[PDB]
């Protein structure tokens, strides 16, 4: 009964995570296609992720009452992870906002698509890995953040570099935010990964 | 009794936050004075912040059992905020690690000191504001993050700019990390601020 309740709580959380995977996907499509209308719908739907988090937070908080070791680590992991997920969500709304500030006009792409693709697959991997409670799949996912950081710096060096080589900054500033939003998105995934290692291990360790 | 218990839970959390304010202060002093030994003690003491968080997380989780609206929002706020605090802590250990990678040799400072000073005072303000549960003091603190972002971009443009004007990157890369650690530190403070508005308001809103 309680085990069934926890399991149901896990499904609520994956539902939320699937919702943020979809909006991340939508955010990046709105960016590739310069779809300012799709960006606006993303911005307006962000509150449903906030709402979904509070619902989960609340059934977590009440579940503690209606009690032991691994189950305690579990409910704490859902509470902590659903929060990281709404912050992931906000950073996808952030990318949608930067898309509204884009002028075309000129100028910038494929590296960004790659940083985006690795961000998405990290979350999709996490969502499959999470129900397994496998520390090692979590750890391997977290490790791919090294690559996103490399994308982050390479793209930062390039974008601001695009002033001294030849002069563009309305869009530049916007692409700086975008890559910062992806870098943060991926950092939270890594945070959810560490929570997963804590769940199997009993100790939150830093990765 | 329960109200006294919550109050005591709040003091545990401020204790943790005072600990992270101290280590942030120590991190930045270790940076100003190039004290590689102080950096090492920061790195090794990070686990006590992890430990303090788990203790708080655990008395939170158990407190729900030993039950109403504002008190529910409260315990959820402590659980969520103590986590942001250990991530703040990790970013201060991160700065300490970058200090170990610094060569002197050359080259870079005062702008960084300023970004650092505003980061610290934001947390010190938050720690005083938190027991008041005043949404407005939280909101005013969160707003100062705009300035830290401005420091972040100005210092990023400058540091990487310091290759094309004249060529330095071991240290450059390290000062990029440092300013990224401060920028993240300050972002989590803003996150704790929003949790405070949610506590008075009943809704997590995005700032
Ligand atoms: Zn099922
Ligand atoms: Zn990262
Ligand atoms: Zn950590
Ligand atoms: Zn007291
Ligand atoms: Zn910031
Ligand atoms: Zn948010």
Coordinates of C-alpha atoms and ligand atoms in Angstrom, one line a residue:
Chain A
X1 CA 0.0 0.0 0.0
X2 CA 2.7 2.5 1.1
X3 CA 5.1 0.9 -1.5
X4 CA 2.3 1.4 -4.1
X5 CA 1.9 5.0 -2.9
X6 CA 5.7 5.7 -3.3
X7 CA 5.6 4.1 -6.7
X8 CA 2.7 6.4 -7.6
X9 CA 4.7 9.4 -6.2
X10 CA 7.6 8.4 -8.5
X11 CA 5.2 8.4 -11.5
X12 CA 4.0 11.9 -10.7
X13 CA 7.6 13.0 -10.7
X14 CA 8.5 11.3 -14.0
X15 CA 5.3 13.0 -15.5
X16 CA 6.8 16.3 -14.4
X17 CA 10.2 15.4 -15.9
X18 CA 8.6 14.3 -19.1
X19 CA 6.7 17.6 -19.2
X20 CA 10.1 19.5 -18.8
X21 CA 11.7 17.3 -21.5
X22 CA 8.9 18.3 -23.9
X23 CA 9.2 22.0 -23.1
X24 CA 13.0 21.9 -23.5
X25 CA 12.4 20.2 -26.9
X26 CA 9.8 22.8 -27.8
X27 CA 12.1 25.6 -26.6
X28 CA 15.0 24.5 -28.8
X29 CA 12.6 24.0 -31.8
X30 CA 11.2 27.5 -31.2
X31 CA 14.9 28.6 -31.3
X32 CA 15.9 26.7 -34.5
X33 CA 12.8 27.8 -36.4
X34 CA 12.6 31.3 -34.9
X35 CA 9.0 30.7 -33.9
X36 CA 8.2 33.6 -31.6
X37 CA 4.6 32.4 -31.2
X38 CA 5.8 29.0 -29.9
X39 CA 8.1 30.9 -27.5
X40 CA 5.1 32.8 -26.1
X41 CA 3.1 29.6 -25.4
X42 CA 6.2 28.2 -23.6
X43 CA 6.4 31.3 -21.4
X44 CA 2.7 31.2 -20.5
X45 CA 2.8 27.4 -19.7
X46 CA 5.7 27.6 -17.3
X47 CA 3.3 28.0 -14.3
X48 CA 1.9 24.5 -14.9
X49 CA 5.4 23.2 -14.0
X50 CA 5.4 25.3 -10.9
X51 CA 1.9 23.9 -10.1
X52 CA 2.9 20.3 -10.8
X53 CA 5.9 20.7 -8.4
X54 CA 3.7 22.1 -5.6
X55 CA 1.3 19.1 -6.0
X56 CA 4.2 16.7 -5.7
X57 CA 5.9 18.6 -2.8
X58 CA 2.5 18.4 -1.0
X59 CA 1.8 14.7 -1.4
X60 CA 5.5 14.1 -0.4
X61 CA 5.1 16.2 2.8
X62 CA 1.9 14.4 3.6
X63 CA 3.3 11.0 2.8
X64 CA 5.8 11.1 5.6
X65 CA 2.8 11.0 8.0
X66 CA 0.3 8.4 6.6
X67 CA 8.5 6.2 8.1
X68 CA 11.8 4.3 7.4
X69 CA 15.3 4.5 6.0
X70 CA 15.4 4.0 2.2
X71 CA 11.8 5.3 1.9
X72 CA 12.9 8.5 3.7
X73 CA 15.8 9.0 1.3
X74 CA 13.2 8.4 -1.4
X75 CA 10.6 11.0 -0.6
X76 CA 13.4 13.5 0.2
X77 CA 14.9 12.7 -3.3
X78 CA 11.5 13.4 -5.0
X79 CA 11.0 16.7 -3.1
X80 CA 14.5 17.9 -4.0
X81 CA 14.4 16.7 -7.6
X82 CA 11.0 18.1 -8.5
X83 CA 12.4 21.5 -7.5
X84 CA 15.4 21.1 -9.8
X85 CA 13.0 20.2 -12.5
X86 CA 11.0 23.4 -12.1
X87 CA 14.3 25.3 -12.3
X88 CA 15.1 23.3 -15.5
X89 CA 11.7 24.5 -16.8
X90 CA 12.4 28.2 -16.0
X91 CA 15.6 28.0 -18.0
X92 CA 13.7 26.6 -20.9
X93 CA 11.2 29.6 -20.6
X94 CA 14.3 31.8 -20.4
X95 CA 15.4 30.5 -23.9
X96 CA 11.9 31.2 -25.2
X97 CA 12.2 34.8 -23.9
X98 CA 15.6 35.2 -25.6
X99 CA 14.0 34.0 -28.9
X100 CA 11.6 37.0 -28.6
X101 CA 14.5 39.3 -28.4
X102 CA 16.2 37.9 -31.5
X103 CA 16.4 40.1 -34.6
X104 CA 16.8 38.8 -38.2
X105 CA 18.6 40.7 -39.5
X106 CA 21.9 39.1 -38.3
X107 CA 23.8 37.3 -36.9
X108 CA 24.6 34.0 -35.0
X109 CA 24.3 27.6 -34.8
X110 CA 25.1 23.9 -35.2
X111 CA 27.4 23.8 -32.1
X112 CA 24.4 25.2 -30.3
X113 CA 22.2 22.5 -31.7
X114 CA 24.7 20.0 -30.4
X115 CA 24.8 21.5 -26.9
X116 CA 21.0 21.3 -27.1
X117 CA 20.9 17.7 -28.3
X118 CA 23.2 16.5 -25.5
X119 CA 21.1 18.5 -22.9
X120 CA 17.9 16.8 -24.1
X121 CA 19.4 13.3 -24.2
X122 CA 20.8 13.7 -20.7
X123 CA 17.3 14.3 -19.4
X124 CA 15.7 11.5 -21.5
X125 CA 18.4 9.1 -20.1
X126 CA 17.8 10.3 -16.6
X127 CA 14.0 9.7 -16.9
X128 CA 14.6 6.1 -18.0
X129 CA 17.4 5.6 -15.4
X130 CA 15.5 7.1 -12.4
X131 CA 13.0 4.2 -11.7
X132 CA 16.0 1.8 -11.6
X133 CA 17.6 3.7 -8.8
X134 CA 21.0 2.7 -10.3
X135 CA 23.8 4.9 -9.0
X136 CA 26.0 4.1 -11.9
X137 CA 23.6 5.1 -14.7
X138 CA 23.1 8.4 -12.8
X139 CA 26.9 8.9 -12.5
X140 CA 27.5 8.2 -16.2
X141 CA 24.7 10.8 -17.1
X142 CA 26.2 13.4 -14.8
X143 CA 29.6 13.0 -16.4
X144 CA 28.3 14.2 -19.8
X145 CA 28.0 17.7 -18.2
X146 CA 31.8 18.1 -18.8
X147 CA 30.9 18.2 -22.5
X148 CA 28.1 20.8 -22.0
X149 CA 30.6 23.0 -20.1
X150 CA 33.0 22.7 -23.1
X151 CA 30.2 23.7 -25.4
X152 CA 29.5 26.5 -22.9
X153 CA 33.0 28.0 -23.0
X154 CA 33.7 27.5 -26.7
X155 CA 30.4 29.2 -27.6
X156 CA 31.1 32.0 -25.1
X157 CA 34.6 32.6 -26.5
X158 CA 33.1 32.6 -30.0
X159 CA 30.1 34.9 -29.4
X160 CA 31.9 37.7 -27.5
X161 CA 34.9 37.2 -29.8
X162 CA 32.4 38.2 -32.6
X163 CA 33.0 41.9 -31.6
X164 CA 36.7 42.5 -31.9
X165 CA 37.1 40.4 -35.1
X166 CA 34.2 42.4 -36.6
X167 CA 31.6 44.4 -34.7
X168 CA 26.2 42.7 -33.3
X169 CA 25.5 42.6 -29.6
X170 CA 21.6 42.7 -29.3
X171 CA 21.6 39.1 -30.6
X172 CA 25.0 38.3 -29.1
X173 CA 23.7 39.0 -25.6
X174 CA 20.7 36.8 -26.3
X175 CA 22.8 33.9 -27.5
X176 CA 24.9 34.3 -24.3
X177 CA 21.7 33.9 -22.2
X178 CA 20.6 30.9 -24.3
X179 CA 23.8 29.0 -23.7
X180 CA 23.8 29.9 -20.0
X181 CA 20.2 28.5 -19.8
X182 CA 21.3 25.2 -21.4
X183 CA 24.4 25.1 -19.2
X184 CA 22.2 25.5 -16.0
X185 CA 19.6 23.0 -17.4
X186 CA 22.3 20.4 -17.6
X187 CA 23.7 21.3 -14.2
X188 CA 20.3 20.6 -12.5
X189 CA 20.2 17.2 -14.3
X190 CA 23.6 16.4 -12.7
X191 CA 22.2 17.5 -9.4
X192 CA 19.3 15.0 -9.8
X193 CA 21.9 12.4 -10.6
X194 CA 23.7 13.0 -7.3
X195 CA 20.4 12.7 -5.5
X196 CA 20.1 9.3 -7.1
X197 CA 23.5 8.2 -5.9
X198 CA 22.5 9.4 -2.4
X199 CA 19.4 7.3 -2.6
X200 CA 21.4 4.1 -3.2
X201 CA 24.3 5.1 -1.1
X202 CA 22.8 7.0 1.9
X203 CA 25.2 10.0 1.4
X204 CA 25.0 13.0 -0.9
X205 CA 28.4 13.1 -2.6
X206 CA 29.7 15.9 -4.9
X207 CA 30.3 15.0 -8.6
Chain B
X1 CA 5.8 22.8 21.5
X2 CA 5.5 22.2 17.7
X3 CA 6.0 26.0 17.1
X4 CA 9.1 25.8 19.4
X5 CA 10.2 22.8 17.3
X6 CA 9.8 24.7 14.0
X7 CA 11.6 27.7 15.5
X8 CA 14.5 25.3 16.5
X9 CA 14.4 23.9 12.9
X10 CA 14.8 27.5 11.6
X11 CA 17.8 28.0 13.8
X12 CA 19.5 24.8 12.5
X13 CA 19.0 26.2 9.0
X14 CA 20.4 29.7 9.8
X15 CA 23.4 27.9 11.5
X16 CA 24.0 26.1 8.2
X17 CA 23.6 29.5 6.3
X18 CA 26.0 31.2 8.7
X19 CA 28.5 28.3 8.1
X20 CA 28.2 28.9 4.3
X21 CA 28.6 32.7 4.7
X22 CA 31.8 32.1 6.7
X23 CA 33.2 29.7 4.0
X24 CA 32.3 32.1 1.2
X25 CA 34.1 34.8 3.1
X26 CA 37.1 32.4 3.7
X27 CA 37.0 31.4 0.0
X28 CA 37.3 35.0 -1.2
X29 CA 40.0 35.8 1.3
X30 CA 41.9 32.7 0.2
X31 CA 41.6 34.2 -3.3
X32 CA 42.6 37.7 -2.5
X33 CA 45.7 36.5 -0.5
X34 CA 46.5 33.5 -2.8
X35 CA 46.4 31.3 0.3
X36 CA 46.6 27.8 -1.2
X37 CA 46.6 26.2 2.3
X38 CA 43.3 28.0 3.3
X39 CA 41.9 26.8 0.0
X40 CA 42.7 23.2 1.0
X41 CA 41.0 23.4 4.4
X42 CA 37.9 24.8 2.6
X43 CA 37.9 21.9 0.2
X44 CA 38.2 19.3 3.0
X45 CA 35.5 21.0 5.2
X46 CA 32.8 21.0 2.5
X47 CA 31.5 17.6 3.7
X48 CA 30.4 19.2 7.0
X49 CA 27.9 21.3 5.0
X50 CA 26.7 18.2 3.3
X51 CA 26.3 16.6 6.7
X52 CA 24.5 19.6 8.2
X53 CA 22.1 19.5 5.3
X54 CA 21.2 15.8 5.8
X55 CA 20.7 16.4 9.5
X56 CA 18.2 19.2 8.7
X57 CA 16.6 17.3 5.9
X58 CA 16.0 14.4 8.3
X59 CA 14.5 16.4 11.2
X60 CA 12.3 18.1 8.6
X61 CA 11.1 14.8 7.2
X62 CA 10.4 13.5 10.7
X63 CA 8.7 16.7 11.8
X64 CA 5.9 16.3 9.4
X65 CA 4.8 13.2 11.4
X66 CA 5.3 14.1 15.1
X67 CA 0.4 19.0 9.9
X68 CA -1.1 22.3 8.7
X69 CA -1.0 25.1 6.0
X70 CA 1.7 27.7 6.7
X71 CA 3.7 25.2 8.7
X72 CA 3.7 22.9 5.7
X73 CA 5.1 25.6 3.5
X74 CA 7.6 26.3 6.2
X75 CA 9.1 22.8 6.5
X76 CA 9.1 22.5 2.7
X77 CA 11.0 25.9 2.5
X78 CA 13.7 24.7 5.0
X79 CA 14.2 21.4 3.0
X80 CA 14.4 23.2 -0.3
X81 CA 16.6 26.0 1.1
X82 CA 19.1 23.9 3.0
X83 CA 19.9 22.1 -0.4
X84 CA 20.5 25.4 -2.2
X85 CA 22.8 26.3 0.7
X86 CA 24.9 23.1 0.2
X87 CA 25.1 24.0 -3.5
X88 CA 26.3 27.5 -2.5
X89 CA 28.9 25.7 -0.3
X90 CA 30.1 23.6 -3.2
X91 CA 30.6 26.7 -5.4
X92 CA 32.7 28.2 -2.6
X93 CA 34.8 25.0 -2.5
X94 CA 35.0 25.4 -6.3
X95 CA 36.6 28.8 -5.9
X96 CA 39.1 27.3 -3.4
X97 CA 40.0 24.7 -6.1
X98 CA 40.5 27.3 -8.7
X99 CA 42.9 29.1 -6.3
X100 CA 45.1 25.9 -6.2
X101 CA 45.3 26.1 -10.0
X102 CA 46.5 29.8 -10.0
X103 CA 50.0 30.6 -11.1
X104 CA 51.9 33.7 -10.1
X105 CA 53.5 34.4 -12.5
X106 CA 50.7 36.4 -14.2
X107 CA 48.0 37.6 -14.8
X108 CA 44.5 38.7 -13.7
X109 CA 40.9 42.0 -9.6
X110 CA 38.9 44.9 -7.9
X111 CA 35.8 44.3 -10.0
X112 CA 36.0 40.6 -8.8
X113 CA 36.3 41.9 -5.2
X114 CA 33.1 43.9 -5.8
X115 CA 31.2 41.0 -7.3
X116 CA 32.4 39.0 -4.2
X117 CA 31.4 41.7 -1.7
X118 CA 27.8 42.0 -3.2
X119 CA 27.5 38.1 -3.1
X120 CA 28.5 38.1 0.6
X121 CA 26.2 40.9 1.6
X122 CA 23.2 39.3 -0.3
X123 CA 23.6 36.2 1.9
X124 CA 24.1 38.2 5.1
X125 CA 21.0 40.2 4.3
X126 CA 19.1 37.0 3.6
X127 CA 20.1 35.4 6.9
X128 CA 18.8 38.5 8.8
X129 CA 15.7 38.7 6.6
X130 CA 14.7 35.0 6.7
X131 CA 13.3 34.7 10.4
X132 CA 11.1 37.7 9.5
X133 CA 9.4 35.8 6.7
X134 CA 9.0 39.2 5.0
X135 CA 8.4 38.6 1.2
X136 CA 9.6 42.2 0.4
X137 CA 13.0 42.0 2.0
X138 CA 13.4 38.7 0.1
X139 CA 12.4 40.3 -3.2
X140 CA 14.8 43.3 -2.7
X141 CA 17.7 40.9 -2.0
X142 CA 16.9 38.8 -5.1
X143 CA 16.9 42.0 -7.2
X144 CA 20.6 42.6 -6.5
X145 CA 21.4 39.5 -8.6
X146 CA 20.9 41.7 -11.7
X147 CA 24.1 43.5 -10.6
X148 CA 26.0 40.2 -10.1
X149 CA 25.0 39.1 -13.7
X150 CA 26.4 42.5 -14.9
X151 CA 29.6 41.7 -13.1
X152 CA 29.5 38.3 -14.6
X153 CA 29.3 39.4 -18.2
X154 CA 31.7 42.3 -17.9
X155 CA 34.3 40.1 -16.3
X156 CA 33.7 37.4 -18.8
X157 CA 34.1 39.8 -21.8
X158 CA 37.3 41.2 -20.1
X159 CA 38.9 37.8 -19.3
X160 CA 38.5 36.1 -22.7
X161 CA 39.2 39.5 -24.3
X162 CA 42.6 39.2 -22.7
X163 CA 43.7 36.9 -25.5
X164 CA 43.1 38.8 -28.7
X165 CA 44.4 42.1 -27.3
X166 CA 47.5 40.3 -26.1
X167 CA 47.9 36.5 -25.5
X168 CA 47.5 33.7 -20.5
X169 CA 44.8 31.1 -20.4
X170 CA 45.8 28.7 -17.5
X171 CA 44.8 31.6 -15.1
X172 CA 42.1 32.9 -17.4
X173 CA 40.2 29.6 -17.4
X174 CA 40.5 29.7 -13.6
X175 CA 39.1 33.2 -13.2
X176 CA 36.3 32.2 -15.6
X177 CA 35.3 29.4 -13.2
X178 CA 35.6 31.7 -10.2
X179 CA 33.2 34.2 -11.6
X180 CA 30.9 31.4 -12.6
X181 CA 31.0 30.1 -9.0
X182 CA 30.0 33.5 -7.6
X183 CA 27.3 34.0 -10.2
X184 CA 25.8 30.5 -9.2
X185 CA 26.2 31.3 -5.5
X186 CA 24.1 34.4 -6.0
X187 CA 21.5 32.7 -8.1
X188 CA 20.9 30.2 -5.2
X189 CA 20.4 33.1 -2.8
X190 CA 17.7 34.4 -5.2
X191 CA 16.2 31.0 -5.2
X192 CA 16.0 31.0 -1.4
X193 CA 14.4 34.5 -1.7
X194 CA 11.6 33.1 -4.0
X195 CA 11.0 30.3 -1.5
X196 CA 10.5 33.0 1.1
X197 CA 7.9 34.8 -1.1
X198 CA 6.1 31.4 -1.5
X199 CA 6.1 31.0 2.3
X200 CA 4.2 34.3 2.8
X201 CA 2.2 34.0 -0.4
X202 CA 1.4 30.3 -0.9
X203 CA 2.7 30.3 -4.5
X204 CA 6.2 29.9 -5.9
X205 CA 6.6 32.7 -8.4
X206 CA 9.5 33.3 -10.7
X207 CA 11.7 36.3 -10.1
Ligands
LIG1 ZN1 2.6 2.0 -12.0
LIG2 ZN1 27.7 22.7 -16.3
LIG3 ZN1 26.6 19.3 -3.5
LIG4 ZN1 15.4 30.5 19.9
LIG5 ZN1 22.7 35.4 -11.7
LIG6 ZN1 11.3 28.8 -10.6

